[PDB]
Amino acid sequence: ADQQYECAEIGGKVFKARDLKNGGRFVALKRVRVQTGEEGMPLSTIREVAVLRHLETFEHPNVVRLFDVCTVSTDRETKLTLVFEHVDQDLTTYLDKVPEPGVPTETIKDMMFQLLRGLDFLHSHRVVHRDLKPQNILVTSSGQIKLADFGLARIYSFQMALTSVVVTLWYRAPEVLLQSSYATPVDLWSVGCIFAEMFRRKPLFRGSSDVDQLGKILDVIGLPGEEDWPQAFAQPIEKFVTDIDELGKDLLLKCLTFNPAKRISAYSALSHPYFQDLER
Amino acid sequence: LNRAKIDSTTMKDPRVLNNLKLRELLLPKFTSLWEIQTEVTVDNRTILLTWMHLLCESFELDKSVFPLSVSILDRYLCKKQGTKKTLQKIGAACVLIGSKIRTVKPMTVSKLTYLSFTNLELINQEKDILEALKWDTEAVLATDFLIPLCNALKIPEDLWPQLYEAASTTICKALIQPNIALLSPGLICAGGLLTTIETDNTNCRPWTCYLEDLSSILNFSTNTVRTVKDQVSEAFSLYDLEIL
Numbered sequence: 001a002d003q004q005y006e007c008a009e010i011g012g013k014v015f016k017a018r019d020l021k022n023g024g025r026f027v028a029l030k031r032v033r034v035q036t037g038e039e040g041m042p043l044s045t046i047r048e049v050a051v052l053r054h055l056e057t058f059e060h061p062n063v064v065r066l067f068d069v070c071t072v073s074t075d076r077e078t079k080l081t082l083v084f085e086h087v088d089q090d091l092t093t094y095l096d097k098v099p100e101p102g103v104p105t106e107t108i109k110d111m112m113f114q115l116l117r118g119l120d121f122l123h124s125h126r127v128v129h130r131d132l133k134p135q136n137i138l139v140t141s142s143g144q145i146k147l148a149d150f151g152l153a154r155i156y157s158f159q160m161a162l163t164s165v166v167v168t169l170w171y172r173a174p175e176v177l178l179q180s181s182y183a184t185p186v187d188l189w190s191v192g193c194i195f196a197e198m199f200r201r202k203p204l205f206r207g208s209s210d211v212d213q214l215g216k217i218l219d220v221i222g223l224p225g226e227e228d229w230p231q232a233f234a235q236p237i238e239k240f241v242t243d244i245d246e247l248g249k250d251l252l253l254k255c256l257t258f259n260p261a262k263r264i265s266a267y268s269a270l271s272h273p274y275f276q277d278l279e280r
Numbered sequence: 281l282n283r284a285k286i287d288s289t290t291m292k293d294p295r296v297l298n299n300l301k302l303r304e305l306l307l308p309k310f311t312s313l314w315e316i317q318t319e320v321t322v323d324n325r326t327i328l329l330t331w332m333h334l335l336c337e338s339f340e341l342d343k344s345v346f347p348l349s350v351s352i353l354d355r356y357l358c359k360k361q362g363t364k365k366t367l368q369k370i371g372a373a374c375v376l377i378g379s380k381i382r383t384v385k386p387m388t389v390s391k392l393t394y395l396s397f398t399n400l401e402l403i404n405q406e407k408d409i410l411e412a413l414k415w416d417t418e419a420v421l422a423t424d425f426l427i428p429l430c431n432a433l434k435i436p437e438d439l440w441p442q443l444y445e446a447a448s449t450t451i452c453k454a455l456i457q458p459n460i461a462l463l464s465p466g467l468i469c470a471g472g473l474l475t476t477i478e479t480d481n482t483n484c485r486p487w488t489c490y491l492e493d494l495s496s497i498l499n500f501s502t503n504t505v506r507t508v509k510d511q512v513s514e515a516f517s518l519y520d521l522e523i524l
């Protein structure tokens with residue numbers, strides 16, 4: 001029994017299915033569990049849906065597209081299906097399957113360009129995607145980038161409260177690990193770490209715990225002076241990121257800057273001399 | 281516990297203001313408030329928004345829950361019908377949706393109920409609101425303009441804490457009044473700010489000196505700014521718990 005669509009899975013739970021409305025196309029169905037007698041609709045979902053609905057007249061190429069929400073309800077609970085466009089691959093599986101010497105560096109440039117643009121869009125509408133990781137970055141067959149999963153995103157406003165919990169530890173910024181205020185820079189940290197994970201086809205900061213996490217970071221980035229600290233615990237980045245070209249290293253460090261106030265932004269990163277040699 | 285600090289990307293970028301004005305042009309052109317309604321009137325609105333307001337103020341929700349919960353309410357009541365004997369349930373479920381989106385610790389059902397129907401009835405009302413608006417719940421809030429306007433009028437960052445604090449309180453109370461619903465969020469905000477700058481000027485230039493500029497920033501006429509300053513100020517006066 002599958003309504004209007006033809007659904008044992010590909011990842012509540014996500015499924016690959018077709019539409020009987022259109023000429024027999026392809027959609028991504030997100031089934032969401034909504035426990036009976038609780039708080040109503042999940043916090044996470046309302047936020048996600050609202051962002052994507054709010055910005056969909058901007059038809060932006062680098063954000064995933066939402067089509068519909070199911071809602072379907074005596075004995076049954078709520079059944080939340082969300083139909084999205086299907087994208088063939090996430091970044092993770094992509095990186096895994098790419099034949100040898102890894103991904104061609106031209107792909108590394110253009111994909112990173114596309115990612116930074118997705119972000120530049122979001123932040124200029126005051127939205128912070130606080131959950132960038134390779135599983136959340138989707139790639140179309142024309143090598144095209146699509147940010148996904150917006151269930152932790154929100155419109156930022158001055159003096160608003162924050163949970164001290166955002167991003168998988170592996171991609172978490174120091175701001176969050178140190179339990180401080182965090183904002184847009186949190187996305188560029190992920191960018192810094194995805195940019196590395198691309199060249200080297202393995203995560204850059206992997207730990208068991210938050211303290212551990214924070215340690216492996218200061219391992220590379222170095223321990224910066226008091227000025228940039230808001231008495232505990234460099235080796236040039238090229239040691240963990242071989243195959244990186246000189247101009248990419250400057251961007252990489254720029255995003256992996258400890259002090260959040262001094263980090264590179266999506267807008268001006270897009271104009272860092274690294275992308276200069278693109279094709280357009 | 282942690283609060284959002286100054287983020288130049290989100291507050292100082294000239295084009296954030298630009299996009300706010302643009303996304304403002306999305307929501308509907310309100311000629312006549314609640315016009316599709318047979319029972320409930322505008323007088324009802326003022327009581328319910330007074331309660332919805334109290335609720336946010338009393339539970340200490342982020343300054344932007346209330347504006348959004350007002351937006352959701354109006355939008356929702358362009359589409360489905362409300363009855364006087366159910367208006368409270370509707371407004372209750374707007375604050376629920378709102379708090380769930382613009383605040384870190386949402387309001388719970390077991391808290392709006394006991395303080396006002398059973399929970400399933402609240403939950404079904406959340407479910408009916410959402411699906412009527414097709415889950416398009418977000419919106420430009422008068423309150424989103426505050427900081428971008430401050431930056432553009434080149435007010436020194438040092439004053440943003442206090443100014444933000446006073447002006448959002450001022451904006452959130454004004455929004456109770458019927459005649460405020462029809463104004464564009466940027467104008468409501470402009471007005472909130474001028475009012476604030478006036479009463480307690482406090483190491484800050486006189487309201488006069490910001491009119492000409494807001495006129496150019498927002499792209500309205502100097503007269504329609506001066507009128508909205510006075511409208512917000514009056515709306516703010518009209519606040520009265522006695523009315524519940």
Ligand SMILES: CC(C)[C@@H](CO)Nc1nc(Nc2cc(N)cc(Cl)c2)c2ncn(C(C)C)c2n1
Binds near residue numbers: 014088090
């Ligand atoms: C594990 C899986 C469920 C994740 C990928 O992180 N989600 C995912 N993955 C996708 N793509 C994908 C497709 C295939 N065939 C394989 C892999 Cl690994 C990812 C998607 N294409 C559209 N969506 C919706 C949620 C926007 C997608 N969501």
